Structure formats: structure tokens, C-alpha cells
Amino acid sequence: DDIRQVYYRDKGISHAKAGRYSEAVVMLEQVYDADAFDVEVALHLGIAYVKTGAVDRGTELLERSIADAPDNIKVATVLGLTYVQVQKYDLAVPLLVKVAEANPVNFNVRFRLGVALDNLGRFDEAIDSFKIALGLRPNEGKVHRAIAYSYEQMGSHEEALPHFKKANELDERSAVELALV
Numbered sequence: 001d002d003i004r005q006v007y008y009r010d011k012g013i014s015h016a017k018a019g020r021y022s023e024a025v026v027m028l029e030q031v032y033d034a035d036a037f038d039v040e041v042a043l044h045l046g047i048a049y050v051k052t053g054a055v056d057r058g059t060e061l062l063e064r065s066i067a068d069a070p071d072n073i074k075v076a077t078v079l080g081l082t083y084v085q086v087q088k089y090d091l092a093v094p095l096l097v098k099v100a101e102a103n104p105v106n107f108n109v110r111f112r113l114g115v116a117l118d119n120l121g122r123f124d125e126a127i128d129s130f131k132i133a134l135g136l137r138p139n140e141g142k143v144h145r146a147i148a149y150s151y152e153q154m155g156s157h158e159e160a161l162p163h164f165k166k167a168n169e170l171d172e173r174s175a176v177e178l179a180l181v
Helices: 002-017 021-028 039-051 055-068 073-085 089-102 107-119 123-136 141-153 157-180
Strands: none
Touching: 002 021, 002 039, 021 039, 039 055, 039 073, 055 073, 073 089, 073 107, 089 107, 107 123, 107 141, 123 141, 141 157
16 A cells, blocks of 8 residues: 555645645545654645635644644644634744744744734733834834734823834835835
8 A cells, every 4th residue: 555655645745835735635635644644744735725725624634733743843834824814813822932933034923923912912922023023024014003003902002103103104115116016
């Protein structure tokens, strides 16, 4: 059975890495096995299941993966980001903390970590994360806006206002620039 397993594994992972998610599901389903667990197969089929609309199914494979390989950052990134997308903000936080510590130049991860924290009512911590994201991309208007909103939710209107104004200044630079390309 090994020749057969390795055929569907290699072909499936190839499809998934190329963005051929549907063909990745078709192939990797024929090798994935919960008892003889393989993290690279579970990761790619998880990705493929989320991309093709089986988001609960996919996240469950990613959860089984992160249980088997707790320090795998590529799993943690997918799964943490996917949690924010379905508002499982509380599960998202520990994964995104760990990914941000390992890849400190990943803007999206730090941004979504802030969003998760803000949703959980941890406004000072969200702001901390938003400020680190802003260090990475200081011309991101959405980050000042997110920081303004977290302040406002604490009743810190004085600290919010300069952030709203800066976000507006930056959004004017940005969306106009993109439309002129």
C-alpha cells in the first residue's frame, strides 16, 4: 500500500501548494488517516477543506495537527487566522502570540491578533499589538483606526481623536494612490 499512499500524498500536497485546492481534497482524502497521522497531509488537506468551504472540517484537521506538532508555525498561522475569520477569538490568541513571536515581521498576524484582543474586550493589549503592527507598516490607516476604536471603547476620547485624524490622512494617501496605478 506504500506506493499508493506516496502517490496521493505527493500529488495532493503539490496541488495544495499550487492553489489547486479542489484537486488537493480529491487526492489527500485518499491518504489521510487519523490513526497513522501525517502532519503535512493534515495541514494541506485542512487548508484545502477551508478553501473549498468545509471550514469546520478543515479546522478540525488543523487542530489535530497542532496537537501532534505543537510548535509548527505554518499550522499555527493557518489555524489562528482561520479562528479570527470565524470569531473564535479566544482560540486565536495563543496561536497568534506564538506565531508573532516566531515571525516578528508578519503584519497580518499581529494585526489580527489585535483584532482578536479588541473583540475579547482586552483593549490595552489590543492597542499594544496595533502599535507593533504600525511599526511594521506605519502608513496603514486601518491600524490607526483600530487603535482609535479601542481607545474610544475605554472612554479615552482624547487619545482616540489623533488616531482617527491620522487614519483619515493615511486613507487619503493610500486609496487614491492605488486608484492612480
